[PDB]
Design a protein around this ligand. Sequence first.
Ligand SMILES: [Zn+2]
Lengths: 15, 397, 91, 300
Amino acid sequence: RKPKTEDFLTFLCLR
Amino acid sequence: DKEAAFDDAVEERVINEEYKIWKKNTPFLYDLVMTHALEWPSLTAQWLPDVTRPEGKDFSIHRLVLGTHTSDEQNHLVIASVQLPNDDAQFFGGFGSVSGKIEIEIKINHEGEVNRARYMPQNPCIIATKTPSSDVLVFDYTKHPSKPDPSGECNPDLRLRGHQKEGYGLSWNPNLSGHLLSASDDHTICLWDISAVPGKVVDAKTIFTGHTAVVEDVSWHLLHESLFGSVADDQKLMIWDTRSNNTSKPSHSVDAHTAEVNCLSFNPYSEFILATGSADKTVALWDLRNLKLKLHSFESHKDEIFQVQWSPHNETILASSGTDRRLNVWDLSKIGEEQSPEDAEDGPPELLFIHGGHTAKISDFSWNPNEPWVICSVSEDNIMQVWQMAENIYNDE
Amino acid sequence: FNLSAHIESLGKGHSVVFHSTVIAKRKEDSGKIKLLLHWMPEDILPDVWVNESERHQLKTKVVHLSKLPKDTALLLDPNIYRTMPQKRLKR
Amino acid sequence: VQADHELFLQAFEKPTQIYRFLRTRNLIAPIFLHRTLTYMSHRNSRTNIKRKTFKVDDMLSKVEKMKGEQESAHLQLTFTGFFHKVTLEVLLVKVCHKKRKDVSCPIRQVPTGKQVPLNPDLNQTKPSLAVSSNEFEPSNSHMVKSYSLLFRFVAQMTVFDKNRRLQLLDGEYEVAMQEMQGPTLQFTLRWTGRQKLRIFYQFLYNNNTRQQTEARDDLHCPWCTLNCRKLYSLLKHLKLCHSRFIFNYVYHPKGARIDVSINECYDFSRNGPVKRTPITHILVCRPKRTKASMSEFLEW
Ligand SMILES: [Zn+2]
């Protein structure tokens, strides 16, 4: 299974 | 201080981001969006009652009463013409950058900014204006040239005295020809009977001194010739009767809002209903049979409301505008309607539509009397918009 | 408290999660005990009087952003709503 | 390498931040109602039926009846003791409604005034009286937002809320105090009168896939959590509300593959009036189904 789109995008903010 | 200047720069960016998002969604929110950049902003907007249809043509000519708000330049009273399509209409942007669709027909020299311009319903050639000075000016546009004299000389047909300050409130009696009311920052309401009174100066027939703060708006009752309402920074709504001999006390006085009341509008379909707009961010609903009850309070605007107008075509439809850069269309028939969680998330059931096409305070707006659901709205960034929300919002099947 | 981080963890991407604290208690003339709950984040939600039994299942309160009191919801960030310009020459 | 991957991350981070921020802002302060978008019709439960029969006049009767089925006295407070391990002044805090001029809600403070025992021993008790006059009114409701009691270590407690309801009932109270377990004030108060789709978002940079993902909540916008309910609605939402990206949809019976890429074509003074060059634009113009035009008053 692939990482979830919402988690990818959350990662992107919190950086 | 310095922190606020930073947050304002951020906001300017955010406002433009949201503006781009609105532009892309317009074909999915509206049946019509015309956007015009006026040379100078207009503090006033009002559709004239007339519509012309050229015989061998698929459009009709509509007209507006606008004005100018300059920065060290000549001000004019403006009559603009707008071409809307017929029923056999035209096929982000669709026809961006168009020509000959919104034009200035008449421009007449005016002493300072037009705070408000309104046409006399009995003869729509006569326009009354609110100046940044004490006088209220009356113009019969037919009695003036379209092309203004570059000298700038303002020659109004009548000069109405007297207030001691400028104002915004202005209202012609739709049942007594030439009976005009005006509100001022001098706490008073003046009344003139221009219908017969002859130099080219006219003094007030009656001055009503009930308010104790800046009077913001004044409006005649649309069905009963001896009634009018006024709103002031008093936090009060006052109902007046011309027949009364006491001009210091109204027929009714209401503690209408929790801050300055800026506008009022009488329903054309009902002899009892009216609505008020306030700095308290709400639109209040009133029934003249019992002013000791606020029928409803419409809450959605994030800031002051400066205009409130009923739809000329629908008794349950009211629109409000302000400094939050939005124009909200309300439906009283939807008050109290049960909602799905998704529906309830967008706002109360009475809120029919939010128009977020403006990126600055909305100075005024006007419902087109010949074309249902067509509104013209003007902002302080020089942008005028002629728009109509998508039919499926108000119609079914 | 970072609004972005909070909404993304506790809030499931759309809500604010409040925590209560007992700041007062009262014993009525009738045999009943009520508690005054104070919400955290502070100054957004009002203090609520609650039954002594009702303390639990009220230790936290998850409010959807569109359900926050709109007057006070702006305290959450300087750029949710702003008056542009703040300083006005004309009405 | 890691330098190229960080540029990829950086490209997607800037718009994601904007969209996630607007998710918060627009949920409180919208640009437009999503229920009013044509590709979002499902969002609104309701219809326009009532309107044709709705009579604005009949609202008074209905409102007057609701009011008919809805809900004076001095307030006395007797202090028993301050607990810790003192001079106690009580004030009536009047938080007033904000007027246009005011920066914030003006606070009006009315002093009420006494000496209360420190850690009083019960079974050794031998009093402090501070009463409040009817300063509250349903008359000054247009001026005063809410009324509150200030105890001063300090503590505050509202007597009447915004919707003006008495929440400080008669009884035996204990309030927690604060600097500038826990200091307390003890008093007696009396009023003395359905099928999961597989939606993959592939993030492309240099027009080749650098991050493969799968939406957890299939028909919810990953940027702003909007529950579009149909794939049709989700694709319009994405393409129009998130135009900083180019979305390339690829159909599958089991879901969809949406390819996300960076749109490389994304793009007054506020002090006094400003001259401009008149320009007109027609963003939308569509023929209406039902002809509404007031043709009777039309000139030739
Ligand atoms: Zn989205």
